[PDB]
Design a protein around this ligand. Sequence first.
Ligand SMILES: NC(=O)[C@H]1CCCN(C(=O)C2(O)CCSCC2)C1
Ligand SMILES: [Zn+2]
Length: 140
Amino acid sequence: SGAIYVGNYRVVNRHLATHNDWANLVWEDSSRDLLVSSTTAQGCDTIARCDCQTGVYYCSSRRKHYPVSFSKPSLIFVEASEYYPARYQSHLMLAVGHSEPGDCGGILRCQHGVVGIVSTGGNGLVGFADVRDLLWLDEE
Ligand SMILES: NC(=O)[C@H]1CCCN(C(=O)C2(O)CCSCC2)C1
Ligand SMILES: [Zn+2]
């Protein structure tokens, strides 16, 4: 579990969104595994606006932050899970690291701020849903 809290937005994995998230919906995209809901309180996270390919992510199944090198956001084939069939997920970045079911929502960050959240795992790989292109998270 986990979310990004920027401005009056809460960014979560679409597959982990709550009823309150759907009842206060701003935007959602199944192909990216992302959903954004509105919040009453202002958040403290800042979004990175950069092309970094190195950063650090939080892994809840290890209680640890790990430095990683990650690929550029791309269209990657993801195997069937309890939440999605086998399909192409867009704006996904891969790295070598631990990610088991429950690690989704952990933040990946670089020197500029939040880059994205854990969205996929298994096989000694971890995939992150990028948020750096969502410029509207910085306004309204
Ligand atoms: N964004 C997605 O399509 C993910 C939905 C949840 C499940 N996804 C995963 O990668 C695993 O849970 C599969 C079992 S091993 C741990 C990682 C894919
Ligand atoms: Zn950066």
